[PDB]
Curated annotation (Swiss-Prot), chain A:
Linked residues for Glycyl lysine isopeptide (Lys-Gly) (interchain with G-Cter in ubiquitin): K5, K90
Species the sequence originates in: Severe acute respiratory syndrome coronavirus 2
Effect seen on changing Q189A: Does not affect ability to cleave and inactivate human TRMT1
Gene coding for it: rep
Cell compartments where the protein resides: Host cytoplasm; Host Golgi apparatus; Host nucleus
Residues included from the entire protein: 3264 to 3568 of 7096
Effect after changing C145A: Complete loss of 3C-like proteinase nsp5 cleavage
Protein name stated in the entry: 3C-like proteinase nsp5
Length: 305, 296
């Protein structure tokens, strides 16, 4: 019993964290085999960030301008290249702690664990989701750049995020491990603002099924809804549209509890209308959207209470 | 910016997790040097233990079978002497925590870590964890510098869904016993010093709507807090909040007057750090650490 925001064990990622220094800037790098991946803005000054020409800044650099530190050992850089917004530093030593891994690009609504690092040293781990506006509501201070997001399914680490910047509202933006940003963001200091955010409807529904699995049904009602009527109501509360794919994905949880997706949609509609009336669901007074249908199946029991 | 329930990096503990089987029961063990620590309920415990030999205990570390060469009991923990020292043993200490203190939990099943989360020892000595059958032997810890301080080992789930366990010396937290009997968690209370720390974290992150011009006395605050099932606030708690009071310019009894107003009026449709409830699972030290950048 119980329901917590659980992160994946971070050990496999901790053994890949390194410190990258270029001139006066120091940030984090990910060391996999003989390559260190880090944000390309490590080659920039603060002045450069207004309109940086990365190709022009990089051509003026040699291998020995990049200092890479793994624990107490200095790694020697023997090559460098840029791939989108990521700098790839070829080093002379392969990481003996390299786990089985893949680089995966996630979609909004997907969750992942973040290992927050400073000076190549891991300080904490937390779970979060890629928001519909492509930002992440993280907890990052200056020096956290290069910190990574990941999932561990079985013994394989799937890297999905690398931290690049904080936006004026305090939310965070970054790239996949191939250097492609999530969202319409650039690694430039410009008027960049996160778009209006919305609630991840399929995740709220999954969390309502998790509450039913853990023995709580006070929020159910005797109504059903069409998918269109649900979406017309949900969009008024800034909820993401629920698609037929989302209904298909909730199928297993619907069969485990005996509550049709559209009947759970009717209960969500009523919750938006009435609020909680002093009650909580899984210890929360807000509707939670950072648990996917997959996370609920992973964490919760296969037997409903 | 941002404020998350953050756990310590779990790598140092992951390298200590093993699977312990005794007959039909399978649970988790902690392998430090040549000793495996696990709940004694894996097996009248003295009478059950005397009938066991070393070969009755099967210990599995990854894909390798460890050979048990001795066994002894210390309170509610079984200590299995194995023939191999753990080469991944970190620098460690066994410490007993107090209610209100927080720690990270590495939840395991069959000796394999599945997740990590942060939680607090409640005033009623239970933990609001997330554990399924097979999680027994999962451990709680903090990391200070490069040293892992083990503070909790999971033993059982209570009828309300909350969890109970021991320190690593086998002493239960709370009035619980390791057996099937009518055991219920006492009425819980809110960890006041932690709620205050989280209010200071909200001010640091730019949330001041709850701040007011008023200040209170410690006695008046405690008379009000006792009415809402909040733990009494002591002079030690006021002293401990000193650094956060100096950083934001809000005296502790100044923040107590804000908390008193939130207790009598609620939030009025507003949130603090994305929450509609007053959060009590962040200590003053956790707030200072997450708003500073301490690494391990
Ligand atoms: C003093 C300061 O920079 N504070 C914070 C606070 C919090 C921060 C959290 N994450 C990242 C930071 N770093 C950046 O945003 C550097 C950067 C600037 C301009 C564009 C880009 Cl692509 C990257 C943070 C920086
Ligand atoms: Cl995805």
């Amino acid at each position: 019993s119980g329901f917590r925001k659980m992160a994946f064990p971070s050990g496999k990622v901790e053994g890949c964290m390194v410190q990258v220094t270029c001139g006066t800037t120091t940030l984090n790098g990910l060391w996999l085999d003989d390559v260190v991946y880090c944000p390309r803005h490590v080659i920039c000054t603060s002045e450069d960030m207004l309109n940086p020409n990365y190709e022009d800044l990089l051509i003026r650099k040699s291998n020995h301008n990049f200092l890479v530190q793994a624990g107490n050992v200095q790694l020697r850089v023997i090559g460098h290249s840029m791939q989108n917004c990521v700098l790839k530093l070829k080093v002379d030593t392969a990481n003996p702690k390299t786990p089985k891994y893949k680089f995966v690009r996630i979609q909004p609504g997907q969750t992942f664990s973040v290992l927050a690092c400073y000076n190549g040293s891991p300080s904490g781990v937390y779970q979060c989701a890629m928001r519909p506006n492509f930002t992440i509501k993280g907890s990052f201070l200056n020096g956290s750049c290069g910190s990574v997001g990941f999932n561990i399914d079985y013994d394989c680490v799937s890297f999905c995020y690398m931290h690049h910047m904080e936006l004026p509202t305090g939310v965070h933006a970054g790239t996949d491990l191939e250097g492609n940003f999530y969202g319409p963001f650039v690694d430039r200091q410009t008027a960049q603002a996160a778009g209006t955010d919305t609630t991840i409807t399929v995740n709220v529904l999954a969390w309502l099924y998790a509450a039913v699995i853990n023995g709580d049904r006070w929020f159910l009602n005797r109504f059903t809804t069409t998918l269109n009527d649900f979406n017309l109501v949900a969009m008024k509360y800034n909820y993401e549209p629920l698609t037929q794919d989302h209904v298909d994905i909730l199928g297993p949880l619907s069969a485990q509890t005996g509550i049709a997706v559209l009947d759970m949609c009717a209960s969500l509609k009523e919750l938006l209308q009435n609020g909680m009336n002093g009650r909580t669901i899984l210890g929360s007074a807000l509707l939670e959207d950072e648990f996917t249908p997959f996370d609920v199946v992973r964490q919760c029991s296969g037997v409903t209470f």
